[PDB]
């Protein structure tokens, strides 16, 4: 009779990425009109993270669903709309992400 202990199933975080120069150290996948990264979800997902890049230093993990970037919601966004938002984000990139337990 081992009772299941309390466990987090889903998280929504606000992560602030800091890049003085160069990149955010992440790749994104998916978007409206593209093949899904996870099952049927058409949302923008983080497909990889550089270990020596800023995103890893901010807590960004692989599989995080990208919901918002510095005040722009990416719900139902085409892939190139997320792309443009991220490239055009300045030195501080605060994003809202949806995370799921593995």
């Amino acid at each position: 009779l081992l009772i299941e202990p309390a466990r987090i199933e889903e998280e929504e975080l606000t992560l602030t990425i800091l890049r003085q120069t160069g990149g955010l150290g992440i790749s994104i996948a998916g978007g409206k009109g593209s093949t899904p990264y996870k099952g049927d979800d058409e949302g923008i997902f983080i497909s990889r993270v550089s270990e020596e890049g800023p995103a890893a230093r901010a807590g960004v993990r692989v599989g995080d669903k990208l919901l918002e970037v510095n005040g722009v919601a990416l719900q139902g966004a085409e892939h190139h709309e997320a792309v443009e938002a991220l490239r055009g984000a300045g030195t501080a990139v605060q994003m809202r992400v949806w995370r799921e337990r593995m």
Partner: peptide
């Protein structure tokens, strides 16, 4: 159509 983009 599958896009992946590093930024």
């Amino acid at each position: 159509l599958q896009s992946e983009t590093s930024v």
